[PDB]
A paper describes a structure:
In human cells, [name]-[name] execute the active export of physiologically important polyamines such as spermine from lysosomes to the cytosol, a function linked to a palette of disorders. Here we describe a series of cryo-electron microscopy structures of a yeast homolog of human ATP13A2-5, Ypk9, determined at resolutions reaching 3.4 Å, and depicting three separate transport cycle intermediates, including spermine-bound conformations. Ypk9 exhibits ten TM helices and a soluble N-terminal domain (NTD) in close proximity to the membrane, perhaps involved in lipid regulation.
Next, additional structures were determined, all in the presence of [name], and using N- or C-terminally linked GFP protein. Spermine uptake is accomplished through an electronegative cleft lined by transmembrane segments 2, 4 and 6. Equivalently, completion of cargo-binding is linked to the proceeding E2.Pi state, where [name] is accommodated in a cavity on the luminal side, coordinated by conserved acidic and hydrophobic residues, including the conserved VPPALP motif. As such, the composition of the cavity also allows binding of shorter physiological polyamines, e.g., SPD and putrescine, in a similar manner. Comparison of the structures reveals major rearrangements of the TM helices linked to [name] uptake. Based on these observations, we speculate that the affinity for [name] increases from the E2Pinhib to the E2P* and E2.Pi states. The structural changes that orchestrate the [name] pocket are coupled to a rotation of the A-domain, leading to a 6 Å movement of the TGES dephosphorylation loop as observed in other P-type [name], and a similar movement of the adjacent NTD.
Numbering used by the authors: 203 to 299, 315 to 547, 557 to 720, 746 to 787, 791 to 798, 826 to 1011, 1023 to 1030, 1034 to 1393
């Protein structure tokens, strides 16, 4: 009996291990008695480290006989789940692809593993081919009665119902982290030591942080549950009749109806059987164009695969996805295939909740630093305890002092201070209309090294504009200039006149209807009508000699003929006219070949290759027509024998301010790529116009030369687009084949083949070189972003559709551009709809990163200075007073820390990135030198004060510490002079922020604190003298204290700018030259260097 298994859930990530255990009933008693005895510490310690809990309670057993299982993933986060068993009696094949009895299963992250007995394993994905699907006769007659019920036990309900959790569960999963336990212990220590005010302050700030984080999490999870909760009402063929049911009672096999008008959205992944349908797949592709779907023939059942997760075109022509609108339908039924989380939209939603560890190592490294500091504080506690039992002091004093020395070294207000930079950045972003939801992501904005991009909604207007109109004259059968405008059309001549005929076509060849003074109807007609500027069974001309027209009848656009016609009669002419507009491919089989110019085919190829959509117009004259002829003669006589007029052209025109933002991003050493769902010819042209691809480079793309994507052993040919002769060395490395710049533009079908059957090195080179990525579903967007991240990139995204959701959530920083169905996952949410909020986010990220690092260094220095002062004082059982602590802790550190995080970022993207890690050498090395300088200054001040003739030595006191010394006061003033100047020196400045001379609050706060301290030193009033427990000093010694404080500033400044970085580089070079361990480099750098050098080699 097997009792372990390993699986890979996601596309490539999520390696998990499942094991099965049993409760000992003795370890459980030990655990409960231990919890009772310790009052609650065992519960905490066995919730933080469940490995020992399992080792204490669990006893290993095989899978067949089990009661709960443990699932451990690649990030080492264990979990306890309970196996569920249900009575069930059908053949094994009903559940997979014998007899099955128990039907054991486990649910993990909405995946549902089932237990195969004879193979003795857990299986996640098996499509349930349900072999009845052989003929339309079988598939049309749906399942009857009881057969549904058993299905309900295997597939569950058809509802994407994520599980919400209560407030108390959030609290027990949030507060119980170890740091808050440490904070509670510190608070107990303060209140037991009569040190109230500071404890109350940090309690208030901790409570505020908890409240804001809790509200954040609750709002996020509430919002995510509204994008994935759909409820409709359909009619199903359960028992030979049509019965009305909710959308939740559907199981694979039920045949429902799609022709009814109540049904406005597809309930589940379906397949047509009769009739026809019209849907717009705005959720799978970014476009909003109407798509027509036709019934599935008897052959296509064979190739259907309910688990392929991406369907070929042969079967995609008949598949009705779930969650897509329904424009129009004909007696048409449909057969469901997948329900629940197996649906493409359901699978996307499920993959939006799977956990993924972060590559930003800031907060975790800070916590590791505090843990090392605690390891030091333990030794300090031991030494203090020995030195205190030496002096024969009382026991309460020894305990209290030795324990407060713990909270001195591990400051309980470091994490609550490390968020001020992001807290201040959020409102600047909100002022510039960008709305952030996860503040922890702001720092990540400073690490962006790549920036992906949508096309249709982001880099381009949503609709299709009108570029120009071309016409061929009958004087010479050749085309003319571009004729962008309509005024030129009105004032041009050679329905006999060509230009006026084309204007007539653009004016009255539609079926638009007027609502609210504007026009509605087919999306393409609207743009033409607006371009004309005219008005609308006759079309009224604009006031600003063009005659009006009067329509007698019209044949709308025919799905099979692919054209439309309008028979009208201008008032002037006794005879009528017929205008026909349609696609240029089937046009030649209607019009006269004499009317077709010599430029037809090559000009059509030129326009189509650049990516436009072309439509052609034609005219005809009917010498005699009346009210009886139109009803007597059909469209066949209308169409045949027309006169070619001209081409009208559409264009996906890009937003006015994109070619500048992309140029700036390229000039700031940030690469950019396009990841779109549209064609592979429009995408390349828009990338040429925008600036992603340089104006002179080539664009090689892959083609299938031997076999389609099915065969596991196929060959690829990397051809060129403009010149189909040049190729790339395929087996071989992607290099130009027997020149300076080029860019592979991979389609969306060959990319899957590359990821599957191609070596890793070719994949890496394609990732480094590829600029354009078209014809991709959301899943390929997401896993392409993950592939980018897996070679040490840090990539963002930008999009404005539910198409993009997964790529927005899986990217390091994802900026949305809308407010519906796409801002649920994206951290940020712009509202100006242009790509101008990307530089904003990057700038604020860099400023926030440098600010956070500066604050961390400042708080660490504060901790060390206080520890050194207290360690000097403890050598004689003395201590700082209970109010000097308050002054230092509350009126010097918190105000300077808050105001050090106030200045804004620069007004321009620079060309260099900030340090983005804590355990580095260039961060640690300049910190320990500052610590050394601080300690040296304090030691010098102490030695200096111990030699004056009015010195008042400390007194050892058994009941309480003595505060009125001449050795406490000197260290107090040295510390006060050091805190302010350390805050001034460690400030972030010119490169990624505003220089401190242009920001007033910081300088004002430093000045007021320094003047307060200097006045408290030089001439203090008596109440301060008897209130802070000071002692007399000669006026010649205060000047010496000021001198030490001053010279510390010079030493710290010179070290921080000049010497400390030099020492860091010196130590780094010595380590490299002595320890002979290679320096790791980011992969894409290595691949780029290999590529350029080897290309130069040829
Ligand atoms: F508008 Al798109 F992918 F083309 F969101
Ligand atoms: Mg879009």
């Amino acid at each position: 009996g097997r009792s372990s298994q390993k699986m890979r859930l996601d596309n490539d990530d999520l390696t998990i291990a499942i094991s099965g255990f049993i409760t000992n009933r003795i370890g459980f008693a030990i655990y409960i008695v231990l919890c009772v005895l310790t009052g609650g510490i065992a519960w905490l310690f066995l919730r933080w480290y469940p490995k020992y809990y399992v080792k204490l309670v669990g006893c290993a057993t095989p899978f067949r006989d089990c009661q709960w299982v443990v699932i451990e993933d690649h990030f080492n986060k264990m979990t306890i789940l309970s196996i569920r068993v249900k009575p069930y009696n059908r053949p094994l094949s009903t559940v997979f692809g014998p007899v099955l009895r128990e039907l054991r299963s486990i649910t993990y992250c909405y995946y549902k593993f089932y237990y195969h007995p004879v193979l003795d394993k857990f299986f996640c994905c098996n499509g349930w081919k349900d072999p009845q699907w052989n003929s339309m006769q079988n598939a049309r007659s749906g399942l009857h009665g009881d057969e549904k019920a058993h299905r309900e036990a295997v597939f569950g309900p058809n509802s994407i119902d994520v599980d919400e959790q209560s407030i108390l569960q959030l609290l027990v999963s949030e507060i119980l982290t170890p740091f808050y336990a440490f904070q509670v212990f510190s608070l107990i220590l303060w209140l037991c030591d009569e040190y109230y005010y500071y404890a109350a302050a940090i309690l208030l700030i901790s409570a505020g942080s908890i409240i804001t984080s809790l509200l954040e999490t609750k709002e996020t999870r509430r919002r995510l549950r509204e994008m994935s909760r759909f409820e409709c009402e359909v009619r199903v063929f359960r028992g030979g009749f049509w019965r009305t049911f909710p959308s939740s009672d559907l199981v694979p096999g039920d045949v429902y109806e799609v022709s009814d008008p109540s049904l406005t959205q597809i309930p589940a992944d379906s397949l047509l059987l009769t009739g026809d349908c019209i849907v717009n797949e705005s959720m799978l592709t970014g476009e909003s164009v109407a798509v027509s779907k036709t019934p599935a023939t008897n052959e296509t059942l064979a190739k259907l695969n309910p688990a392929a997760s991406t369907f070929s075109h042969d079967v995609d022509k008949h598949f009705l996805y779930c969650g897509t609108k329904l424009i129009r339908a004909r007696a048409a039924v449909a057969l469901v295939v997948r329900t629940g989380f197996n649906t493409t939209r359901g699978a996307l939603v499920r993959s939006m909740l799977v956990p993924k560890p972060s590559k930003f190592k800031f907060y975790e490294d800070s916590f590791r630093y505090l843990k090392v500091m605690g390891c030091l504080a333990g030794l300090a506690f031991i030494v203090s305890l020995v030195n205190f039992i030496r002096l024969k002091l009382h026991w309460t004093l020894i305990l209290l002092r030795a324990l407060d020395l713990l909270t001195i070294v591990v400051p309980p207000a470091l994490p609550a201070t490390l968020t001020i930079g992001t807290s201040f950045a959020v409102q600047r972003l909100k002022g510039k209309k960008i709305f952030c939801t996860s503040p922890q992501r702001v720092n990540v904005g400073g690490k962006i090294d790549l920036m992906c991009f949508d096309k249709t909604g982001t880099l381009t207007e949503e609709g299709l504009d009108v570029l120009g109109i071309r016409v061929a004259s009958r004087v010479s059968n050749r085309f003319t200039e571009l004729l962008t405008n309509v005024d030129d059309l009105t004032w041009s001549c050679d329905p006999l006149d060509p230009y006026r005929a084309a204007l007539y076509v653009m004016a009255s060849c539609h079926s638009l209807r007027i609502v609210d003074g504007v026009a509605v109807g087919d999306p393409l007609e609207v743009k033409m009508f607006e371009f004309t500027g005219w008005s609308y069974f006759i079309a009224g001309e604009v006031i600003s000699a063009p005659p009006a027209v009067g329509v007698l009848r019209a044949f709308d656009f025919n799905p099979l003929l692919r054209r439309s016609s309008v028979i009208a009669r201008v008032v002037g002419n006794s005879g009528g006219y017929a205008l026909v507009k349609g696609s240029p491919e089937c046009m030649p089989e209607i019009c006269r070949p004499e009317t077709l110019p010599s430029d037809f085919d090559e000009l059509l190829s030129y326009y189509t290759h650049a990516g436009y959509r072309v439509i052609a117009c034609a005219t005809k004259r009917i010498p005699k027509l009346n009210l009886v002829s139109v009803n007597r003669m059909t469209r066949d006589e209308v169409e045949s024998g027309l006169d070619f007029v001209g081409f009208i052209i559409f264009e996906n025109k890009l937003k006015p301010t994109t070619t500048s933002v992309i140029k700036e991003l390229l000039s700031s050493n940030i690469g950019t790529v396009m990841i779109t769902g549209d064609n592979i010819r429009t995408a390349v042209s828009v990338a040429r116009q925008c600036g992603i691809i340089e104006e002179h480079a080539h664009c090689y793309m892959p083609r299938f030369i031997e076999g389609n994507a099915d065969d596991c052993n196929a060959k690829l040919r990397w051809e060129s687009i403009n010149n189909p002769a040049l190729e790339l060395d395929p087996t071989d490395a992607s290099l130009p084949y027997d020149i300076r710049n080029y860019a592979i533009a991979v389609t969306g079908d060959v990319f899957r083949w590359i990821v599957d059957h191609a070596p890793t090195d070719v994949l890496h080179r394609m990732l480094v070189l590829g600029k354009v990525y078209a014809r991709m579903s959301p899943d390929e967007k997401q896993e392409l972003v993950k592939k980018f991240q897996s070679i040490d990139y840090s990539c963002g995204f930008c999009g404005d559709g539910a198409n993009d959701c997964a790529a927005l959530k899986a990217a390091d920083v994802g900026i949305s551009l809308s407010e519906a169905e796409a801002s649920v996952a994206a951290p940020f949410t712009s509202q100006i709809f242009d790509i101008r909020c990307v530089p904003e986010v990057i700038r604020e990220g860099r400023a926030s990163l440098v600010t956070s690092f500066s604050c961390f260094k400042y708080m660490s220095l504060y901790s060390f200075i206080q520890f050194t002062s207290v360690s000097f004082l403890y050598v004689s059982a003395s201590n700082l007073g209970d109010f000097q602590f308050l002054y230092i802790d509350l009126m010097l550190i918190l105000p300077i820390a808050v105001f050090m995080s106030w200045a804004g970022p620069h007004s321009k993207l620079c060309a260099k990135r900030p340090v983005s890690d804590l355990v580095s050498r260039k961060v640690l090395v300049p910190l320990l030198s500052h610590v050394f300088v601080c300690v040296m200054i304090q030691a010098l001040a102490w030695v200096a004060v111990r030699q004056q003739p009015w010195y008042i030595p400390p007194i050892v006191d058994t009941e309480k510490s003595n505060i009125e010394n001449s050795e406490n006061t000197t260290l107090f003033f040295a510390s006060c002079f050091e805190y302010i100047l350390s805050g001034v020196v460690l400030n972030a400045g010119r490169p990624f922020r505003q220089s401190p001379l242009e920001t007033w609050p910081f300088l004002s706060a430093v000045a007021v604190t320094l003047i307060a301290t200097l006045l408290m030193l030089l001439v203090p009033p008596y109440w301060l003298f008897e209130f802070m427990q000071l002692t007399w000093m000669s006026w010649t010694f205060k000047i010496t204290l000021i001198a030490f404080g001053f010279v510390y500033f010079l030493i710290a400044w010179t070290g921080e700018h000049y010497l400390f970085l030099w020492l860091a580089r010196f130590l780094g070079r010595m380590r490299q030259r002595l320890f002979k361990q290679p320096k790791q480099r980011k992969l894409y750098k290595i691949v780029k260097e290999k590529l350029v050098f080897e290309n130069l080699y040829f």
